[PDB]
Design an enzyme around this catalytic site. Structure first.
Site, PDB file in Angstrom:
ATOM      1  N   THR A 247       0.894  -1.153   0.000  1.00 18.58           N
ATOM      2  CA  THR A 247       0.000   0.000   0.000  1.00 18.58           C
ATOM      3  C   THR A 247       0.931   1.201   0.000  1.00 18.58           C
ATOM      4  O   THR A 247       1.331   1.697   1.054  1.00 18.58           O
ATOM      5  CB  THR A 247      -0.921   0.024   1.236  1.00 18.58           C
ATOM      6  OG1 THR A 247      -1.710  -1.170   1.266  1.00 18.58           O
ATOM      7  CG2 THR A 247      -1.855   1.218   1.179  1.00 18.58           C
TER       8      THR A 247
ATOM      9  N   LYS B 297      -5.885   1.645  -4.817  1.00 19.84           N
ATOM     10  CA  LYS B 297      -5.731   1.033  -3.498  1.00 19.84           C
ATOM     11  C   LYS B 297      -5.916   2.083  -2.404  1.00 19.84           C
ATOM     12  O   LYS B 297      -6.528   1.816  -1.371  1.00 19.84           O
ATOM     13  CB  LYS B 297      -4.345   0.389  -3.360  1.00 19.84           C
ATOM     14  CG  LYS B 297      -4.078  -0.272  -2.001  1.00 19.84           C
ATOM     15  CD  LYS B 297      -5.133  -1.322  -1.676  1.00 19.84           C
ATOM     16  CE  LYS B 297      -4.911  -1.970  -0.311  1.00 19.84           C
ATOM     17  NZ  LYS B 297      -3.649  -2.760  -0.242  1.00 19.84           N
TER      18      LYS B 297
ATOM     19  N   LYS C 105      -1.317   4.840   9.101  1.00 17.10           N
ATOM     20  CA  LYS C 105      -0.475   5.000   7.927  1.00 17.10           C
ATOM     21  C   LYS C 105      -1.304   5.143   6.653  1.00 17.10           C
ATOM     22  O   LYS C 105      -1.130   6.097   5.903  1.00 17.10           O
ATOM     23  CB  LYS C 105       0.469   3.798   7.795  1.00 17.10           C
ATOM     24  CG  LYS C 105       1.159   3.676   6.443  1.00 17.10           C
ATOM     25  CD  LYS C 105       2.132   2.501   6.427  1.00 17.10           C
ATOM     26  CE  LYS C 105       1.438   1.178   6.752  1.00 17.10           C
ATOM     27  NZ  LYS C 105       0.496   0.740   5.680  1.00 17.10           N
TER      28      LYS C 105
END
Ligand SMILES: [Cl-]
Ligand SMILES: [Cl-]
Lengths: 285, 285
Positions: free
Chosen positions: A95, A171, A239
């Site tokens: 990611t 994503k 994150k």
């Protein structure tokens, strides 16, 4: 035969490795967890070690399923990119930002290697069944070289663009939903508790109604069972939602709900639940 | 035979009425929409009119599927409660406060009538198949009298408590999720558009990934098709999330995400999209 190396044997990685083994591909694995490696060997893997340096020189494809860009770069640049044979492909399934995907792809192209910006989703269960969802972008050379791998590990592959970057953008947007849904589920269950509604009852109702979400159904079971053992940590969404925040800011786009979810997960982490299951965000209540 | 009257022939109401007809119950319908009534008659209903005054005196059970408490009270108190025979039951399936459910139940009990606090969910498709999800609370007398109706219209009935009120509390919590999910879906798709990702592609990915939600899958199809024809209006969630807000405030409980969603739907309504499909909340972006 086709040799594929899976770097990162977490829940998703193990599923991919097992799916490759079922597909009959010569499978290699790399992870710091000696137990993950041992299981893979017991299941037919050609090799399994702490790093991929032992087999990077023979694989036709290397799949990287790690938490962040920093870890992707560490695997590639004790790096193994320079050991890979010309024409081989690297499928990055983490990611990361679109910029990082493009920067990494450029570095690999210079080594005559093909890279596929291929972050994934679908959950661990689906992964173990070779039913991942892939949001990928990259050259025809990368897609073609990785076909054996994609056919094995995935059931739904979406080719976003022909250049690295777009896959990671998709994503990022996906994680906005995943993150907000976990936080919303937590908010609703905490309210349910406060209102005096049994959580198991609230769980059954939602999972059979229009307010259900994949994340509610998956994460709130942890809450009902009071098990905050980390499957995916709170800090992961601190994150990820941070990356969503950056993407939106660069586009001068407001995120009322995503900014709120980021603040919630951030609060959960400062409260000391950062390494606990992400469902622990409910503890801020 | 068992006579049941369905008041409110919207998407959910028509499904219930048709399910009762399939179950072989003598079915009556009431709605201001002459076309809904005509369809029911063409399908075997004993009667269908603008109001239930014509048949309230013979039904064994009356189901009320309307938007709010005000409308429930208008149906019951040209009201029909006083025309209902002793022992008959009233199944209130709207989205009202716990206080209103209790107040309404007390008024009906005084008339020797049984009331079931039974808000529902599951969507129109499920409703047409008699597969509603019911979150109900009330006396054994109410549950027993309504069994024929519940068996016909629902596939999952959750008995929250033995007293009116709890069912509506569960529905309120459920609407927090439904509302936040629609808004989160809109936020994510608007960002996707801003980022240059085709919406149909973004839709397919999400509906095959971990970030999916029932509301995303249902409402975002409207966005992809650019059809904001109201199935369920923006103003419905302005109302519902308002009820969620009141419930939380009474409990001195904070709602970071639900308060944000309420503000978003409220903005969409002040912008003039109040009567458009709730997916129109995406227009605030
Ligand atoms: Cl597969
Ligand atoms: Cl049924």
């Amino acid at each position: 035969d086709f040799h594929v190396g899976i770097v990162g044997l977490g829940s998703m990685g193990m599923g991919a490795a097992r799916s490759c083994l079922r597909a009959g591909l010569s499978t290699w694995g790399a992870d710091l967890n000696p137990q993950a490696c041992a299981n893979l060997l017991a299941e037919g893997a050609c090799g399994a070690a702490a790093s991929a340096r032992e087999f990077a020189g023979v694989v036709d494809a290397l799949v990287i399923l790690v938490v962040n860009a920093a870890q992707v770069r560490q695997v590639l640049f004790d790096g193994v990119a320079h050991l890979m044979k010309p024409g081989s492909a690297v499928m990055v399934s983490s990611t990361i930002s679109s910029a990082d995907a493009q920067e990494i792809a450029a570095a690999l192209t210079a080594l005559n290697l093909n890279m596929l910006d291929a972050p994934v989703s679908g959950g661990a269960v689906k992964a173990a069944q070779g039913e991942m969802t892939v949001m990928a972008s990259g050259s025809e050379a990368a897609f073609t070289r990785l076909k054996p791998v994609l056919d094995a590990v995935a059931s739904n592959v979406y080719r976003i663009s022909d250049t690295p970057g777009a896959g990671s953008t998709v994503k990022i947007i996906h994680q906005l939903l995943a993150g907000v849904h976990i936080a919303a589920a937590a908010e609703a269950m905490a309210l349910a508790a406060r209102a005096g509604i049994p959580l198991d009852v609230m769980y059954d109702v939602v999972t059979h109604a229009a307010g259900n979400s994949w994340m509610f159904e998956n994460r709130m079971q942890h809450v009902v069972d009071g098990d905050y053992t980390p499957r995916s940590a709170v800090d992961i969404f601190v994150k990820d939602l941070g990356l969503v925040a950056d993407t939106a800011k660069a586009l001068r786009f407001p995120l009322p709900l995503a900014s709120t979810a980021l603040n919630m997960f951030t609060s959960a982490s400062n409260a000391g639940y950062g390494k606990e299951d992400d469902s622990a965000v409910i503890k801020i209540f």
